[PDB]
């Protein structure tokens, strides 16, 4: 009596995606971003915006029939930071409060065995 | 303003705890000065 989806959270430096799908992942149920929930660009990555997105997604899940989700949280990865930020942690807490069973939580950041050059240059970036 | 460069004895919860709840030390000396001035007089 427990139907499972997959809540795929993508916490970037400038935004947060909360994306629920079926177990296969080919089928989308609800995708909401923090930029759909705030009035200023500066706040799209905020923990506040990620909480509104997750509650918006959790309600749609309960309607469709999903009662549980597995969580696959990720950061940008690649040549950039590998750990999901505060926005992603905020969404995961919001889903837990929402009333959906949380099945299994995994970090699936794309980690290169080897990388191309990062965008900064020789002197660095992110002043 | 002086910025402390030593480890804070108060834990991160405490620094928020006290925020939930012109200076006493400045007034503490003021009492001491009055005591010293009164005794000297």
């Amino acid at each position: 009596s427990q139907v499972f989806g997959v809540a795929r959270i993508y916490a970037s430096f400038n935004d947060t995606f909360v994306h629920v799908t079926d177990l296969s992942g080919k089928e989308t149920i609800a995708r909401v971003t923090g930029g759909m929930k705030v009035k200023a660009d500066r706040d799209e990555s905020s923990p506040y915006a990620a909480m509104l997105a997750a509650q918006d997604v959790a309600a749609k899940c309960k309607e469709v029939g999903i009662t549980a989700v597995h969580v696959k949280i990720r950061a940008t990865g690649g040549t950039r930071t590998k750990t999901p930020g505060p926005g992603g942690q905020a969404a995961l807490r919001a889903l837990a409060r929402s009333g959906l069973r949380i099945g299994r939580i995994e970090d699936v950041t794309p980690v290169p065995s080897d990388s191309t050059r990062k965008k900064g240059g020789r002197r660095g970036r992110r002043l | 303003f002086e910025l402390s460069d030593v480890k804070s004895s108060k834990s991160l919860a405490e620094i928020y705890e006290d925020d939930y709840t012109l200076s006493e030390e400045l007034q503490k000396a003021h009492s001491e000065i009055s005591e010293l001035y009164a005794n000297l007089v």
Binding site: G35, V38, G65, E106, D107, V108, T109 | -
Partner: protein, 237 residues
Amino acid sequence: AVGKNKRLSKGKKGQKKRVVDPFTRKEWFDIKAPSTFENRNVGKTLVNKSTSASDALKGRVVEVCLADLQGSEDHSFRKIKLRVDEVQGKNLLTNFHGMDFTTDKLRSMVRKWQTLIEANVTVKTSDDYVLRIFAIAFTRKQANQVKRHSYAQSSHIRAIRKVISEILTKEVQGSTLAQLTSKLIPEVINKEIENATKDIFPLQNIHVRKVKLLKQPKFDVGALMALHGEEKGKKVT
């Protein structure tokens, strides 16, 4: 940013009206695992109703934890991909498609002051499934060891790698895909590697890290039915 202050974009001009809820036209489908796994029910998926439903369902890959499939947390750090091959009366019949570890378990195993030994082989089963195995092992220190580290000489590493490749090739070739899966679950391959490499160098955390399925034979419904262990309709009146 949905505020009024946000500058108008070109793409806002003409937008389709939301006049149909997509989930009205979706149909749910049950996913069933091969008989090698103890817990056959692995959830359900949905697809647009046939106008066909089968075409979109076939080729669909679902990955699940072995702990769910076996009901034991000893397999919490291993995942199994299952690919839908046949659909019968809302039941999606799946077959082994791959296996992999969680990212946390791998990072847990990789530690400082020891040697990381990894081997891979491309080999085919007796059923003509071409697959690639990845094995990982680490050197360990002895009970009375006093050195801080447990590094192995490159001669040992090549010797251990040669032994592991010999074992991986032997097990896969002399077995079918279903039988190979039955070897992965009890981690019997790893114990075989441990025994063979015992006289070369002590090892720890010997695991078959990953399994890829590179090529597949012609699909045979009869073989799939047997792996899962026809139905007349009911007159409509």
